[PDB]
Amino acid sequence: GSPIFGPQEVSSIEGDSVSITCYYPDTSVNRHTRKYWCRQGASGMCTTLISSNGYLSKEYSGRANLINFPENNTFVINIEQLTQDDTGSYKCGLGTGLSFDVSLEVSQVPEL
Ligand SMILES: *[C@@H]1O[C@H](CO)[C@@H](O)[C@H](O)[C@H]1NC(C)=O
Ligand SMILES: [Mg+2]
């Protein structure tokens, strides 16, 4: 099935911020479980970059937040100071399991 939903593709420009909302099923277990944002890598693993246990990758020091909103069965990942190096294939999810694939594209600032 389709337990998690979010934005399939997120397009931004260098310097921008994004706010990515992931939706989960309306259950107590899901409201209180670990939430995560991870980047899919060439090895096949999805490396956690931020989680609701308070974990943060050094790649996101000073520029990211993950906020759980149990009151509407969502959580939000905020990512700031984007650069082209943030382009990639990500997942938002619950647990370690339930997840949704997000493609983030960060393009160059257009020439004037
Ligand atoms: C969920 O609730 C939070 C807190 O009130 C709100 O800021 C956010 O917009 C809501 N999310 C959605 C998808 O309605
Ligand atoms: Mg590009």
Swiss-Prot record:
Glycosylation sites: 72
Residue ranges annotated for the Ig-like V-type domain, each copy included: 3-99
Protein location: Secreted
Disulfide bonds: 22-92
Function of the molecule: Through its N-linked glycans ensures anchoring of secretory IgA (sIgA) molecules to mucus lining the epithelial surface to neutralize extracellular pathogens. On its own (free form) may act as a non-specific microbial scavenger to prevent pathogen interaction with epithelial cells.
Subunit details: Either free or part of the secretory IgA (sIgA) complex that consists of two, four or five IgA monomers, and two additional non-Ig polypeptides, namely the JCHAIN and the secretory component (the proteolytic product of PIGR). Free secretory component interacts with bacterial antigens toxA of C.difficile and eae of E.coli.
Name of the protein this chain belongs to: Secretory component
Taxonomy of the source species: Eukaryota, Metazoa, Chordata, Craniata, Vertebrata
Gene name for this UniProt entry: Pigr
